[PDB]
Amino acid sequence: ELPAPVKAIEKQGITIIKTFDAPGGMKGYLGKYQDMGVTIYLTPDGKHAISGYMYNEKGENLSNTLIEKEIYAPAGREMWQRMEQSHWLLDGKKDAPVIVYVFADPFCPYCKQFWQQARPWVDSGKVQLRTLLVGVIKPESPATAAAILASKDPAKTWQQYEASGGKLKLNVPANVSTEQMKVLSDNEKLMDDLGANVTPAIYYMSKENTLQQAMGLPDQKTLNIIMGN
Amino acid sequence: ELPAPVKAIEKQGITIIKTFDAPGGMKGYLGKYQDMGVTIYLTPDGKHAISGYMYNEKGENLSNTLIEKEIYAPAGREMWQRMEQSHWLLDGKKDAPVIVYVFADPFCPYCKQFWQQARPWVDSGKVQLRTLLVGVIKPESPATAAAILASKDPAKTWQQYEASGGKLKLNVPANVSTEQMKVLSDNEKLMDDLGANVTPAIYYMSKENTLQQAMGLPDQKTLNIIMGN
């Protein structure tokens, strides 16, 4: 079964996930209390256990690094791959180090404004925006988004669209290709699967490789973090 | 100086108080982050330290026992002794195990009501109420309190006063003895030194010997805890 001192913590409403190797002859237990992951460390004697955070000489919160790397990071990377595999429109260099996904709609003032705030990082080649168009805000939203997706170069047309603030003149299609209705439908299901009920819905990876999100127009702090700044 | 991993925690905004003996070859550091006391444990290797709570086989939160016993318990016992040394009126057996201090005023509905709630525990001989009269609620408050303190048996007169709801008939003194004005003045300074701006202000010791307080009319939970129940 479980060592007495750890069983005592378990009764404090904690559920153990696995055991792991702790430094200094200690045994570690990774667990959770509601949504919060926790680390427990059995002392050498075996009669005591500390519920807390382990730090090394450099000040790294090891407990935090392990929790994120085992409890949080996994699920997020799944949604990141699913986002990567979508038909997103590029903005910036295809090899920009920082990748930012954003669900945008043709009639979303905040989308245009975030597009604007993003200019510096994108022009620098540090950040690339990957836009997943959707049509969920206005009656004409789908017809417009599809008319954007259905052009000679959809990524450029989205740019010119955000830039001009929409005044762009282009041939609406007589038929919205099924391929384009699929992209819109896939993007909208993915947005829903992320519980994103606001556009723009932005997604980025933290320095510790965990999926982060942002809804609406980011304030300066959030903008700086999203931009990897 | 301080071991690297503990110095790392210290920089997280923690101030160390002293070092202590931890089990299993570990060294402990008692500290504080704002008002909260914290325990840090240097692992045997010396390269790591865990900021958290130590539990033994029986489930006792050792970290909590030490913090309260070294950070909280001291100051409270000081105010307890100062309260003990005051001229309080007895209610119940002088040898009742649980001691409860309460600052009361002659015109305080909530004082009368708490007096009422207290009946069961006091009659059982489990709890003794020690009342420190004050005169801070009404113009006639001091004159009344003093008239209570100035009687043949002040403790009984306070009882009969709470019981009868005040209708008690007794000889008001022509002169309020200086001794009685001193008690009222000492009680009022002590009440102030406790930041008690509400009457009744009740004070009791927790099972871990730390000073607890309660202002106004206690709800059922608080009443039960105050009564040691």
Curated annotation (Swiss-Prot), chains A, B:
Effect noted on mutating C108A: Complete loss of redox activity
MF-aspect GO terms: protein disulfide isomerase activity; protein homodimerization activity
Resulting phenotype, C108S: No loss of chaperone activity
Gene ablation phenotype (knockout): No visible phenotype.
Gene Ontology biological process terms from the UniProt entry: chaperone-mediated protein folding
Cited Gene3D superfamilies: Disulphide bond isomerase, DsbC/G, N-terminal, Glutaredoxin
Localization terms from the record: Periplasm
GO cellular component, one term: outer membrane-bounded periplasmic space
Domain of life: Bacteria
Main location (coarse class): periplasm
Cited InterPro entries: DiS-bond_Isoase_DsbC/G, DiS-bond_isomerase_DsbC/G_N, DiS-bond_isomerase_DsbC/G_N_sf, Thiol:disulfide_interchange, Thioredoxin-like_fold, Thioredoxin-like_sf
Keywords assigned by UniProt, alphabetized: Chaperone, Disulfide bond, Periplasm, Redox-active center, Signal
Cystine pairings recorded for this chain: C108-C111
Outcome of swapping C111S: No loss of chaperone activity
Assembly mode: Homodimer. Interacts with ErfK, YbiS and YnhG.
PANTHER family listed in its UniProt record: THIOL:DISULFIDE INTERCHANGE PROTEIN DSBC-RELATED (PTHR35272), THIOL:DISULFIDE INTERCHANGE PROTEIN DSBG (PTHR35272:SF4)
Similarity-based family: Belongs to the thioredoxin family. DsbC subfamily.
Main function: Involved in disulfide bond formation. DsbG and DsbC are part of a periplasmic reducing system that controls the level of cysteine sulfenylation, and provides reducing equivalents to rescue oxidatively damaged secreted proteins such as ErfK, YbiS and YnhG. Probably also functions as a disulfide isomerase with a narrower substrate specificity than DsbC. DsbG is maintained in a reduced state by DsbD. Displays chaperone activity in both redox states in vitro.
Full protein name: Thiol:disulfide interchange protein DsbG
Organism: Escherichia coli (strain K12)
The gene coding this protein: dsbG
